[PDB]
């Protein structure tokens, strides 16, 4: 039809990247665009223009992530990793995960997507050594995958609750969880008078 079959009820991983690229990120500019009191200007229509026309080299600012990546593609920026991409905060989340079998830890919805973007595009901007960050992103990925496999023993006619599951972790499971719960509902509602 008008929409391809592999998109009919879900997002492609590239559309899940596009959604995450709409978030604010903190950067250190390597250009001063700010004009002194003593020139081209941004004029955007989907995001706050007033943050970019006021850059000063090495004073941090927030911009939308797709502009930070476009500036970082030149030497013209550096991307400040969020506080949760630190070897301290990842190791507290790994401890939380091991300590609470019944729940996922309070990682932000975009954590796998943003880790994968910044490890490829901003590999030099981490304060911690990136091989220990990749190592702990994998340690978190694997623990949450066990907790997901435990959760699927409970597919149901009524609902599930999946509190801190990432958007990328929901998006891989969507065409399985919803397709099976749909047949459990059809088998159940068929039995009713």
């Amino acid at each position: 039809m008008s929409l391809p079959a592999h998109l009919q009820q879900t997002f492609s991983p590239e559309e899940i990247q596009f959604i995450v690229e709409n978030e604010p990120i903190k950067i250190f500019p390597r250009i001063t665009t700010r004009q002194k009191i003593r020139h081209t200007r941004w004029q955007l229509i989907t995001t706050d223009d007033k943050a970019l026309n006021n850059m000063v080299a090495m004073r941090s600012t927030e911009v939308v992530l797709w502009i930070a990546l476009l500036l970082k593609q030149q030497s013209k920026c550096s991307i400040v990793a969020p506080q949760w991409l630190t070897t301290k905060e990842l190791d507290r989340k790994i401890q939380y995960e091991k300590t609470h079998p019944d729940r996922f830890s309070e990682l932000p919805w975009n954590w796998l997507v943003l880790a994968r973007i910044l490890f490829n595009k901003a590999k030099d901007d981490f304060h911690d050594p990136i091989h220990e960050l990749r190592g702990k992103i994998q340690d978190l990925r694997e623990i949450r995958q066990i907790k997901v496999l435990k959760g699927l023993k409970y597919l149901n006619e009524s609902h599930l609750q999946l509190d801190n599951l990432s958007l990328l972790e929901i998006n891989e499971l969507r065409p399985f969880i919803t397709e099976i719960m749909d047949k459990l509902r059809e088998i159940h509602t068929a039995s009713l008078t």
Binding site: F18, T40, W66, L160, L162, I170, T178, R185, T189
Partner: protein, 243 residues
Amino acid sequence: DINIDDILAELDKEVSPQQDFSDLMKSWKNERCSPELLPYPHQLMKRLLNRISMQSQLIENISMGFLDNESKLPLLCMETELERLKFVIRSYIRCRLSKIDKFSLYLRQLNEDENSLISLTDLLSKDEIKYHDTHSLIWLKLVNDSILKYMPEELQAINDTEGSVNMIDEPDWNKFVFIHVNGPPDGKWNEDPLLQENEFGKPCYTVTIPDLKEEVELTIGSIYVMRYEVIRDLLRDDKVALI
């Protein structure tokens, strides 16, 4: 302890392009993920299709200055932003054209039903009303000639609901969808009549799923796999968003 904060709040109190894009993203995410054909954002879409026309003229006008600092990053960003924005609207419209294909005989049934709770022009764009009415005649002519011409008269109906199988494919109202429970779109929780507290303090909505006679509490800021027929009223009222 004297708690001041309401006195400090009264001392402290002394539509936009960035907001409309955030409503287009909400509309696109709910449209991709829902089984129903949601009602069209009429005024939002007229606004965005203005800004794309004005901005695409502005990028061309700024490129006339370059014939005569002269830094090019803002041209690159104004262009890549229009590509990012035009993609969301194309992906949005191509998605709801796909639902008009699936639901043609159901939308035709809402339009033949003069007593209907919905007018088709509430639901569809002018270009979707065009697409719907003419794609229906193009497909109807194909099957009507090619195979229906030979059928006995009581079987020539392409939309017979009375037969051994109903020919009108309706939306799957009970589709399981993932939802994220926003709370009210205003931060002002005290307005809402459906919302209530729990044990553990945390607020929620309660909804009853009628086939099972089960109440469920949708606590704010958490994710559920849930039947769409139960969500509709909370989704139309912006209390939840589809993941």
